[PDB]
Design a protein around this ligand. Sequence first.
Ligand SMILES: Cc1nc(C)c(-c2csc(Nc3ccc(C(=O)N4[C@@H]5CC[C@H]4CN(c4ncc(C(F)(F)F)cn4)C5)cn3)n2)s1
Lengths: 404, 135, 115, 112
Amino acid sequence: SNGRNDTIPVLLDIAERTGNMREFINSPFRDIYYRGQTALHIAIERRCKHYVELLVAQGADVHAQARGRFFQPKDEGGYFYFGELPLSLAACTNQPHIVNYLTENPHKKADMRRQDSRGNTVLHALVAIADNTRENTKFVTKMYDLLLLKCARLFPDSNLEAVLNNDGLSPLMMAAKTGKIGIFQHIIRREVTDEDTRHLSRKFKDWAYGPVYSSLYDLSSLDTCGEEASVLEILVYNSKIENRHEMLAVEPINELLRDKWRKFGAVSFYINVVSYLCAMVIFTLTAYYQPLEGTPPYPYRTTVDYLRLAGEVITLFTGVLFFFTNIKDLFMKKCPGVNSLFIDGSFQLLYFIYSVLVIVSAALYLAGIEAYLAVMVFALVLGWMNALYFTRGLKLTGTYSIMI
Amino acid sequence: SNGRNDTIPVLLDIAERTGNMREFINSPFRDIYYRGQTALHIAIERRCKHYVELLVAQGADVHAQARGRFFQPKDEGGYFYFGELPLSLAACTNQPHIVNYLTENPHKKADMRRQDSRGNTVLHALVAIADNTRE
Amino acid sequence: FKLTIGMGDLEMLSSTKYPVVFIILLVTYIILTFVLLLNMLIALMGETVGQVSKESKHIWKLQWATTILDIERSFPVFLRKAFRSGEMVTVGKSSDGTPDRRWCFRVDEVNWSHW
Amino acid sequence: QKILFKDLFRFLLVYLLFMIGYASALVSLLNPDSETFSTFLLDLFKLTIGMGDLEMLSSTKYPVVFIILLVTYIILTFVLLLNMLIALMGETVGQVSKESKHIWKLQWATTI
Ligand SMILES: Cc1nc(C)c(-c2csc(Nc3ccc(C(=O)N4[C@@H]5CC[C@H]4CN(c4ncc(C(F)(F)F)cn4)C5)cn3)n2)s1
C-alpha cells in the first residue's frame, strides 16, 4: 500500500523471537515457474530502497539466484532475464541508489564480479537487457560505466570487463554478437578522463597540433590474430543479420578493415584472381587437347601426353585444395540459412559442386571410359560462371555478378 | 600547466645573462619531420597570447618558416599546412588577437604580404586551410 | 516446346479434331509464356534495383569484409603477427607503475569547432 | 555513350568469357582439327541467333547433355542481355537524374 506495508517489520520481529529469522528472510519459491526468487528480489523489483535496506540488515542473502523459468531470456521461454542475481536485478532496472547500497553497506556487500548460473556477470546482464532504443541505452551505458568504475576502485588488481562467462564471451563480444549497437559503440569509444582509473579506456588522445586531433583507439580485443576470439570475426560471422551492416561501421572497425585491405588484404585477393585464371586456362587447354579416340587411362609416351598429364594433375590439385578449404570452412562455422546464404554461402556451394565434379571425373577416369568427357565439360561449364566470385574488388562488377 | 609555465621568464633571464638570448629564442628543430618550427610557432599554436607577446619582445624571428615534413599539405605526406609562417599560423587557427598583436606591435611587425617557400601569402594559406563546412 | 519457340507445323495442329479449342488454348499458351517472362521482368527491373540501392551496398561490404577475414585466417599465427595492424603505443603507468604497452590504433581527425 | 564505351567493355568481357568457355567445352567434347573448331564456333553464334540445324546438334553422342547445355547457353545469353538492361535501368537513377543537368552545363560551358 502506497509503497509501505507496515506489517513487515513486526512480522520480522515475530520471526526473530521465534528463532528462525535467517530461515525466514530468504524463503525461495519452489514452483518451476518462479524458482530461486526470494523476498530480496521482490523488494528490489518494487523499487523500495528502505525495505531492501531493512531486509538485508538481518542477513538477507544478496547472492540468491532467481533462476526460475520466468527469469529466462525471451528466446528460451521467459519474460525477463536480469542476470539471476539481486545486484544484477538492481542494475538492470535503473536503480543506481540500490546498486550503491548493495555494493557499499556495513552489513553484507555483494561483489560485482560474481557470476550467475549462466556465468553472466553484472555487465553481461546489463548488456543482455540493453536495447537499441535511445532511452534504454541512455541509462544502460551510464550504469555500465558506473559499475565498471566502482569495481576498478574497489578492486584495482583486476578489471570487471575481463571476466568470461560460461560461453567464453565478454560484455563487448556479447554486445557485438547479440546486436546491441548502443552499448557496443559506447564500450568501443569509452574514455575515462579521471586519472585514478584511466587505464580502462579504449580511446586516448595521442597528440594535437592546431585543428588536427589524433585519437588512438584500442584493438586489444578487436584484432588479436586468432588468440582471444577477436570481435571482428564475431561481428562479421556470428552477429545477427539486421544490425550487422551498421554495427560494422563503428569508428575503429571501418578503418581497421581498410588498413587490413591496404596492408595484406588488397593484393592477396588480386593474386588469387590471377592464379585462378591461370589454372582455369590450363584446365581449358587440357580439356581441348584430350584425345577422343581410346579408353582411359591413355598411354602417356609423347610430350603432348606429358603436358596433358601435368594439366590433369594440376587440375586435381586445385580441385582437392578447393574441396579441403570448403570442408574446413563448413566445419568451422555452422551451416547458415536465410539472409546469410546470399552473402557467400551460395558461392562456396557452387565451388563445392565444382570440387565434387572434379573428384567424380577423376573417379570415372580411373575406371570408366564413357561419360568422362561429359562430366569434365560440365565442370568446365560451372567453372567459368564461378569467375563471378572475383567481382567484389570492383564497385560495379560485384553487383553485376550478384544479380546474375 | 593550466596554460602557464612559470619557468619561461627564468630561462630567458638566464639566457640573457649568459649572452645567447637571441640564439636561445629562435631555435629551429633539426629533424626532417619538424624542420623549421621555432618556439614562436609553439607559442602561437598553444593559443597563449601572453607567451607570444613575451617571446617576440626580445627579438623572436617573426618570419621563421616552419617548412618541415609535418607542416606540409595532406597531399604531400603531412598533417597540417598553415602557410609556413607565424602570421599565417596565427591566421590559420582562428586567433584574431594574436594576428592583431603580430601585425601591430612596437617590437617587430610581420608584414602580411610576406610569402613562404611555396609563395603562398597569408590569404593563400587561409584559403588552403578552408573547408566547405559552414563553421 | 517446338511450338513454344515459334517454329511449328500447321498440319498437326488440326490433325486430331477440335481445331478451334486447340488454336485458342495454344494462343493462351503463348500469352501466358509472355506473361511469365514479364513476371520475371517486373521484379527484375524495379524491385531488385530497389534492393540494390541499399542492401546490395551492405552485402558488398559484408562480402569484402569476409574475404579479408578469410584471407587473414588462412595465414599462420606468426605471419598474422607480422602483418598486425596498429602501432605499439604505450599509454601510461599501471597500478604498479609499469607501462601499459597496448596495441592501439591511431586515427586522425580535423575539428575546427572546439578549442 | 555510357552504353557504347563505359559499360560495353565489361559487357563484352563477360560475354566473351562465357562464349569462349562454352564453345571451348563443346568443341573439346565433340570429335571429327583446327577447321572443325572454327566451324563449330560459328555454329555456336548461328544457334545463338535462332536458326540452327538438328542433325549436327546430336551429331556426336551425348544428346541430352548437349541439349541441356545449349539451352543453358541461350538462357545465359538472355540473362546477360537482361543484366545489361537492369544495370542501365534503376542503378544509375540517383546518379543520372541529378548529374544530367550538371554534365550538360559542363559541356555547354566548355563549348563556349
Ligand atoms: C574468399 C577467400 N576464402 C579463402 C580461404 C581465401 C584465401 C586464403 S589465402 C589465399 N591466397 C593467398 C595466400 C598467401 C599469400 C601471400 O603470400 N602473401 C599475402 C600477404 C603476404 C604475402 C604477400 N602479399 C602482399 N605483401 C605485401 C603487400 C603490401 F604491399 F601491401 F605491403 C600486399 N600483399 C599477399 C597470397 N595469396 N586466398 S579467399
